[PDB]
Symmetry: D3
Subunit: 175 residues, 6 copies
C-alpha cells in the first residue's frame, strides 16, 4: 500500500499522531518515502558527516509549504526501522525556513515508551538537545549551498495547531 | 500487500513454515505487523533493558487465543530485518500463558542455514538457551504489571500439532 | 506493491538506473526480493563467514539468463536498508558465469553521494576493490558445491549495453 | 598501568568523580577490570537476554562491602569503550543488597555532555528509567540462583556520602 | 603491562586457558597484540570481504612454529573487545599449515557462558560451523598470494597436548 | 605503558608514521589519550549530532602549537578500536587554526589496506570528502562558541615537513 495516502494522520489528532519514520536516528543517508510507489528511496547522502539526531519522518495525510508531507521528529532511544509507524505525542515545533519555504517540524515523543511519560511540552526537553537539533538543520545543507533559517521553537499547543493546518493542506491538495 | 493475510502458512506445512519476522534478535523495541495496513508498527518499547533473544514474528494465515497470529521464534545467527520471510523448521514449542490467554510460541530454525542442520527437536537446543528464552518471557512484562506463566517446553511434534490448530483458527476467524 | 514489476528500470536509462537493494553491504544473510509477494525473503545464509562487499540488488523490470532480474552492485559508504531505491550510475560490469548461467553484474555508484562524483568508469575504481568483489563471487558458493567463474570486468559502455539487453529480456518474458 | 590503583577517585571529589567504565550500555557480556593485571576480563555472559542499561564501571581507589571497587553507573547517550575514563557527576544512588553484601551503586551523568547539564539529583531522572535499572538488578542474576534486593534510591547527597565512605574503605584495605 | 609475557597461560592448564582476544568476531581488520609494546596494532585489512568467524587471539606465555604466540579461536555469541581476557575450555584444534609453517589453532568455548556448557569436544560443534572456519582460513589469504592448507580437525585431547607443547616452546624461546 | 611517550613516531618517518587512534570513525564521543596515565578518556561529547569522518588520533612522540600531540586523520573503511596503532602513509594536511592556535592535521591512509594503494597525494582524494572533513572542523565547535578557521589543504610533501616539525617540538618540550 501507500502509507502516505492510506494511513490516517493519527488515532487522536492532534494529541496523538502517527509518525511514519523515514530516517532512523544515527543515519547519514537521507531516506524518504517515495510518494508514488510507497517504497523507501535514498534521496541523497548528506554532504557532511552529520547524522539525524531524531527518528525522522512524516505525518500521513498531511501536506506542507515545501510540497511534501509535514515533517515530524520523534525522540527514540533505540531507533526504529524505516517505514515503521510510531504513535507520537507532539511536545513542540521547530520553526525553520528552508530554501525560502516554511518547513517547520513537529517534535514528538513515543506514547508507548514510559521513559518519556513526563515529556509533554517544549520546556521538558534538555536545552542542549533542542540546540543540537536546530544546529543540525542550520548546517546540514551548507555544502549543498541551500539557505536555511532556524527561528526558534514553539510549544506543544503551537505544534498541534500546525498539525491541524497540515491535515487541511492535504485534503485541499488531494481533494 | 498484507503479508499476514496473503502469504500461505508455509511451503511444506507443518514441517516447514514461513516465519514473517517482526522483531530482529537484539531489539528492545516491540515491533508488530499492523494487521490492518501491513506496515511495521512500534507497539511499545519494553519497559526493562531486555532484548529479544530470537528473531520474533508470526506464521502467516494463523490465529491464536490471544487474538493475534501464532507467535514464532526463529534462531538466527545474524538477525534479519523486520518483514523478512524465513523458511523455518519447527523444533519445539514454549508453553506460555499470557494475561490469562494461551500464548504458546513455536521455536524454529532456518532451513537454509546449514549451521542448524542437526537441530530437529527440542533436545538439540542448549538447555541454557531454552532457559534464557523462558526467563525473558517470564519477566519482560513485570514492569507492565501483566502476569505471565511459563509452563515448559514441548517437542517438535507438539509444535507441529499446534501449528495445524492455529492454521484452522485463522480459517474460522476469517472464513 | 511489487517493486520488481511496478518500478521502471530507471529515470534516465541506461545512464541512471534504479537499484532496488536486497542486501546491505556487510550482510551474511542472502536476502532477495520475493518476486511473487514483493516482500523481502531470506534465500539462505552464506555458508562461509563472508559479507556482501556492496549494496546488492536488482534493476526493476529487467530479466537475465539465470532466470532472475539483472543483478546490480551499488557502492554505498553507509549501507541502505533492504527494499531501498537508489538512483545509480553504472560504471562497469563484472563478468561472471554462475552454475552454467551468464550472471553478469552491473557495478554502479549512487548519483546523489558527491563522494563518488568522479567515479564514471571502471578505471576509477581501486584495483583491490574490484579484486575483493570478484574474489567474493569466486568463493562464496564454494561450500555449496556450485561452480562460478569470474572472467573479468567490462567498462561503463559495456555495462550500459547489458542493461539495455536485460530490459528487453524482461519485456519478452512478461510481455 | 593499573587504573584501579593508580588513578585518583576524582578531580573534585565527591562532586565530580572518575568513572572507569567496564561495560558499555547495550552489552550482555559482563566485563570487569582485572584488579591484578589491569586488563579487561570477561567475568561471565549474563544468563538472560538482558543488557546493561548504563555505562557501568568503578570509581578508582575505592573499595566496598562486596570485596570490589565501588560500582558506578554513568548515563551515556553514545556508549563508551571499556577502560574509558569519564568525569562524572553523582546524582543519586541505587540501594542494593547482593548475595548478602551491601552493593549500592552511584548513578551519575557525564559532566561534559551538555544534554545532562540540568541533571543534578535523583528527581531529575525519568521514573521509568530508574525502574528499568532497578529491575535489571532485581532479575539479571535470577538464573544464577543469586538473591538480590533493591531497596530504593537515595539522592545526590547520600550518593556523595557513600563515595567518601568507599574512598576510605580503599585506604584502609590497601594501606 | 604486556599481556603476552605477564599473564599465565591459564588458571587450570590445559583444561582451562586464558584467551587474550585480538580480533572480535565480525571484524575484517586483522588486529594483533604488538608483542613489543602490548598495544593493539592493525596488522592489515583482509584483502577480501571476509570476517573473523570467531573471537580470535592468543594464549599468553605460548609460542609456536610461525614465530608467534599460539592461536586460539573462542566461540562467543556477543563478541568481546580487543585485549579482553576470556577463560576458555579447549574443545578441539584446527590443523593448518600456513606459508610452510605449522599454525594450528585451538578451538575453545567460554567457560562462563552457560550456552556452551555441553560443548566439550569437537563432535559437539555443528559440522557446517567447522567447515565455515576452515574455509575462512583456506581462502582469506588467497589475494595475498600465500599458501594455506587445512588438514582437518583434532579433538579436545589433541588440542590440550598442543597447548602444553606451545607453553614449552615459550619457556625455551624466552628462557 | 604510555603510548604517547614510549612509541616512536613511525617506522619510516615521514613516509610511514604510526597513528595511535583515539576516536573511531562514526563516533560522536570525543575520546583522547590521557597523556598522564595512557588510558582513554572521554574529553567531551560533541555538542552537535556530528560524527568523526575519519579514524582520528595522534602521532606518538610529537607535539604541536595547541599543546597536544600532532593530530592525524586516517582513512579507514572499517573503523578501528581506540588505542589501536596503524601504519599510515601521509598524503596531505588540513590547514586549521583552532581557538587561535595552529592545529593542522595530517591526512593519511593505512599502508596495509590495499584499497588505498593508489592514494599517495592530496589530489587522489575525492573533493567532496576533503570538503566533508573541512566542514566538520569548521562547524563541530560552533555550539561551544570556539572559533575555527579552515584555510585549505596542503599536499603530501607539506604534510611530511610538518610531521618533521612536530617530532622536533616533542624533543624540545620533553627534552
Ligand atoms: Br520528512
Ligand atoms: Br508475535
Ligand atoms: Br540480485
Ligand atoms: Br562494577
Ligand atoms: Br593470533
Ligand atoms: Br587528536
Ligand atoms: Ca523536501
Ligand atoms: Ca526541508
Ligand atoms: Ca519538509
Ligand atoms: Ca498480543
Ligand atoms: Ca503475548
Ligand atoms: Ca501472541
Ligand atoms: Ca538466482
Ligand atoms: Ca547468481
Ligand atoms: Ca543473478
Ligand atoms: Ca563482585
Ligand atoms: Ca554485585
Ligand atoms: Ca559491586
Ligand atoms: Ca603470524
Ligand atoms: Ca598464520
Ligand atoms: Ca599464528
Ligand atoms: Ca586540544
Ligand atoms: Ca583542536
Ligand atoms: Ca590538536
Ligand atoms: Na519530509
Ligand atoms: Na505476536
Ligand atoms: Na539477483
Ligand atoms: Na563492580
Ligand atoms: Na596469532
Ligand atoms: Na589531538
Amino acid at each position: 500500500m501507500n502509507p502516505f495516502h492510506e494511513l490516517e494522520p493519527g488515532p487522536e489528532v492532534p494529541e496523538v499522531v502517527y509518525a511514519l519514520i523515514e530516517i532512523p536516528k544515527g543515519s547519514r543517508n537521507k531516506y524518504e518515502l517515495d510518494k508514488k510507489t510507497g517504497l523507501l528511496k535514498l534521496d541523497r547522502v548528506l554532504y557532511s558527516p552529520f547524522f539525524y539526531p531524531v527518528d525522522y519522518g512524516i505525518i500521513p495525510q498531511t501536506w506542507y509549504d515545501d510540497g511534501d508531507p509535514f515533517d515530524i521528529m520523534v525522540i527514540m532511544r533505540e531507533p526504529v526501522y524505516p517505514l515503521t509507524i510510531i504513535e507520537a505525542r507532539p511536545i513542540g515545533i521547530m520553526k525553520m525556513e528552508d530554501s525560502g519555504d516554511k518547513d517547520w517540524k513537529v517534535l514528538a515523543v513515543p506514547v508507548e515508551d514510559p521513559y518519556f511519560n513526563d515529556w509533554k511540552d517544549i520546556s521538558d526537553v534538555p536545552k542542549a538537545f533542542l540546540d543540537e537539533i536546530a544546529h543540525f538543520f542550520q548546517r546540514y545543507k551548507e555544502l549543498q549551498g541551500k539557505t536555511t533559517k532556524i527561528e526558534g521553537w514553539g510549544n506543544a499547543e503551537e505544534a498541534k495547531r500546525e498539525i491541524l493546518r497540515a491535515i487541511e493542506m492535504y485534503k485541499e491538495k488531494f481533494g
